[PDB]
């Protein structure tokens with residue numbers, strides 16, 4: 001699908017894509033290879049869909065947090081720069097793009113949210129979130145507002161949610177999710193109260209907050225370094241500072257490393273490597289991008305040394321040190337989707353803060369909890385013996401879901417033995433290659449039909465049936481990847497339905513004898 005002898009690059013529409021196009025022209029100059037830069041809407045959702053069919057761009061730019069998902073699905077080339085090139089970037093930027101011990105992208109720049117304030121309206125910006133309501137009352141008397149920022153993307157509200165204890169995944173334990181704890185609830189409650197008391201509007205998005213700030217209508221916004229060009233042009237007299245504290249604690253922004261990955265399906269891998277190493281990640285390449293939209297604190301030591309002198313970069317790094325680097329683990333995409341929904345529903349009053357963060361916690365935990373139940377059932381079906389290891393967190397849910405599946409799953413395998421044996425004998429499975437192709441059939445058959453617990457038990461029960469065969473033919477090491485792919489089919493295709501059902505609690509209640 002992907003054409004040979006050219007480079008197609010995807011980058012987000014808030015970055016310096018005209019700058020990047022100029023590095024493209026310089027590459028074409030030396031090589032005769034044309035470089036096309038695109039900025040499609042929702043490119044971070046579209047990349048996995050298209051790349052999975054061997055389509056999409058040669059090079060994808062995004063914050064590192066999505067790249068583990070892409071690498072797990074096999075959508076990225078491993079990159080292998082020599083030590084001399086690795087030595088040119090900060091080791092912590094390389095750590096952001098390492099997944100399962102392998103480098104999966106080139107790091108470009110460190111991005112952290114700051115408080116941006118209009119110095120002609122607000123000579124001393126507020127140190128605390130708690131003083132913002134009074135400050136808004138003062139500014140409303142003068143025909144202005146205290147603060148506007150994008151309430152549609154949870155990236156911008158996260159720093160307040162994290163301040164008093166909210167977290168995605170502890171230190172990374174995927175079993176320990178801190179989305180519906182007291183600290184998260186306190187942060188999101190303060191946000192909702194701001195909206196209730198008319199200090200902010202639930203509909204405010206990127207464009208509205210940017211237009212209000214850049215015209216001098218609002219004293220403050222929250223945004224990253226990419227936003228500074230547009231403010232420069234507007235001749236607002238602005239500062240960039242430390243985010244306000246909440247309950248005496250720093251705001252903790254999720255820090256991104258803008259990263260460039262190479263599509264596994266690209267026939268132009270050596271061209272992409274040459275472009276990124278020898279054109280983009282140079283003093284002149286990054287300057288060309290930075291002068292279009294600021295990158296933040298760049299990975300390339302030589303150029304960071306020049307930029308570090310900027311007090312706006314010093315404030316970006318101060319917010320970065322108080323926050324933490326995003327995980328790159330594959331459930332980051334599921335975490336963001338759940339938290340986005342929670343913020344928008346709490347802000348709009350469609351749900352309470354309690355309902356909203358309960359559902360977000362269920363959504364963030366869904367893959368792990370589903371794998372635990374499905375993996376345990378396939379293994380105990382295969383061997384005749386239950387797993388002794390503790391169930392961990394929500395162990396009650398897992399144990400009861402497993403006990404339910406033992407009753408309802410064994411019933412399906414008993415009543416439909418005829419068809420299950422028929423299908424099994426037809427597939428003639430003898431190795432993990434056979435199992436990988438079995439996976440392909442399953443996704444199609446399961447997605448084709450309607451959504452209910454009966455069809456979900458049937459998928460899992462067929463999995464148990466196949467697992468018993470794999471043990472029988474000394475292919476026991478194939479059972480975990482079978483559990484993984486059934487889990488992936490289930491939570492990818494039925495996420496929203498599963499969350500509406502209260503995940504595996506809904507399963508336990510539905511079949512409660």
Ligand SMILES: COc1ccccc1-c1nccc(COc2ccccc2C[C@@H](Oc2ncnc3sc(-c4ccc(F)cc4)c(-c4ccc(OCCN5CCN(C)CC5)c(Cl)c4C)c23)C(=O)O)n1
Nearest residue numbers: 416419420422423441442445446449454455457458459462
């Ligand atoms: C109230 O409802 C319930 C309450 C409690 C418990 C269960 C239910 C319930 N509720 C609903 C349904 C069912 C049972 O349904 C079946 C039981 C047995 C067989 C089929 C189905 C239809 C069902 O199938 C699936 N459901 C969900 N996920 C998948 S993934 C997958 C699958 C498919 C192929 C693979 F290679 C691997 C996996 C299938 C599947 C679909 C059809 C199948 O056989 C069709 C007939 N063939 C068999 C072979 N023979 C030689 C020719 C005729 C088989 Cl064996 C399977 C496993 C499948 C469905 O689609 O609804 N049960």
Ligand SMILES: OC[C@H]1O[C@H](O[C@H]2[C@H](O)[C@@H](O)[C@@H](O)O[C@@H]2CO)[C@H](O)[C@@H](O)[C@@H]1O
Nearest residue numbers: 012014063065066111153154155256336
């Ligand atoms: O809103 C959730 C979102 O947060 C981050 O996306 C950022 C991105 O990192 C920045 O470079 C900038 O473009 O704004 C985005 C927020 O709109 C995560 O990187 C992303 O995966 C996640 O969905």
